[PDB]
Every structure is written in C-alpha cells, then in structure tokens.
Design a protein around this ligand. Structure first.
Ligand SMILES: Cc1cc2c(cc1-c1cc(/C=C/C(=O)O)ccc1O)C(C)(C)CCC2(C)C
Lengths: 10, 211
C-alpha cells in the first residue's frame, strides 16, 4: 500500500 | 479527550458519469488522509493501524462526505471536483439503483434532520475508529477512541438540540445504511476494475488491492 504509507508519513 | 471543535476543524479544513465519479473518489482519497491526521489521537496510533483504519473505512468516510455535501441539491450529488451528477445521469449509466439508495437513505435523511458539520465530523470519526477492523495491534485503544467520539457527539447534541432527545441515536442509526451502501459501491468498483472500461487512478486502484 505504497501511496497510503507515504501520505501518512508526512 | 475528544473535543468536537477539533473534529469540526478537520471537516472545514478539507472542504460517462461513472468515470467522473471515480476520478472524484481518487482525488478525495488524498484529502481523506489529511482529514484523519486532524482527528485527535489518530496520528498517535501505530502507522500500521492508521493504514488498517483508513483501508477499512475510506469508502464509508468519503460517501458520508459527498452525501452531506449534496443536501443543498435535489436528485443529485455534488462531487469534490465541482461536478454534479444528476439522478437521471446515474440511471442512464446503469448505476441508478445504488445512486437512489444514496439519495434516499443518506442525502434526504441528512437534509430532513438538518445534520450539521460537527455531527457529520463525529459520525465520520466513529467510522474511522472502527475497532472491528482486522489486524489491529490494539483494538481496545481504537474502541476507546470511538467511545470518546460518541460521548462527545452526544454531549454536543444534548447542548445544541435539547428539544430533540432522539437526535444522537438518529445520527448513529444512519451508520448501518452507510455500511450497506459502502459495500454495494465497492462491489460496483470491483466490477468496473474487472471489465476494464472505466479508468481508475492510482490511489483508488491501491484501495482495491487485497490485503
Ligand atoms: C467510486 C464511486 C462510485 C459510485 C458512487 C460513488 C462513488 C464514490 C464517489 C466518491 C466521491 C467523493 C467526492 O467527490 O467527494 C467517493 C467514494 C465513492 O465510492 C455512487 C454511490 C454515486 C453510485 C454509483 C457508483 C458509480 C457505483
């Protein structure tokens, strides 16, 4: 789930 | 603590037809992540649980939002992209039945009771903190957060609408309809993906991945 993880990081 | 002010702040911070509808959903998925980050205590959950909660809830979360947005409109929905989809347009695209469920079970009901943005915000935050989501590292912490949201929502309802003692329950009782409609919408989405005649952009596609 690469997009979601990236967006949650910051 | 779970202040309704902070929940409403999160709401106000983020403020063929099937192709247009799918583009809108993808767009709003990016915005949804920003919304959740503004819901008290969400960002303090383990990153893996934040992922689980958003993957579990995104559809209901986004359906609640466009449905409430659409209360000013008759026989239509207002997409985040600035486009309106009329009931007739949805019917003419082969998706009439599920569109009418949204109008009748969500939009019309939200309209009839004048559901406000704080109330919407709290219902969405309840959906977000779904302690039944599979794989959660600490379901109890999520359950505790949900309880804090609905404790705060009820207090708000009693103070703002003391003439309507059944209002809090009435808000909560839109959640089964939201669950059912979210599931049906998802079924259509999987079909669109299967036939391959409908463009689906990257974030919406990612949400359609298996776990
Ligand atoms: C992706 C999507 C599809 C559909 C619908 C909705 C969505 C959909 C739109 C959005 C758009 C949100 C926005 O514009 O704020 C978000 C999630 C969604 O599942 C409705 C419920 C209108 C019925 C017909 C179909 C085409 C199955």
């Amino acid at each position: 789930h690469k997009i979601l993880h990236r967006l949650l990081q910051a | 603590d779970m202040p309704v002010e902070r929940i409403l702040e999160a709401e106000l911070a983020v403020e063929d037809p099937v192709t247009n509808i799918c583009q809108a959903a993808d767009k709003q998925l990016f915005t949804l992540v920003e919304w959740a980050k503004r819901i008290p205590h969400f960002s303090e959950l383990p990153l893996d649980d934040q992922v689980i909660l958003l993957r579990a809830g995104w559809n209901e979360l986004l359906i609640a939002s466009f449905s409430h947005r659409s209360i000013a409109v008759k026989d239509g929905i207002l997409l985040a992209t600035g486009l309106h989809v009329h009931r007739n347009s949805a019917h003419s695209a082969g998706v009439g039945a599920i569109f009418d469920r949204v109008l009748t079970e969500l939009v019309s009901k939200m309209r009839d009771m004048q559901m406000d943005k704080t109330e919407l915000g709290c219902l969405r935050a309840i959906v977000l903190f779904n302690p039944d989501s599979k794989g959660l590292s600490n379901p109890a912490e999520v359950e505790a957060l949900r309880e804090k949201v609905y404790a705060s929502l009820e207090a708000y309802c009693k103070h703002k609408y003391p003439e309507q003692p059944g209002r809090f329950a009435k808000l909560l009782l839109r959640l089964p309809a939201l669950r059912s409609i979210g599931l049906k919408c998802l079924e259509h989405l999987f079909f669109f993906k299967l036939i391959g005649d409908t463009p689906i952009d990257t974030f919406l596609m990612e949400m359609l991945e298996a776990p």
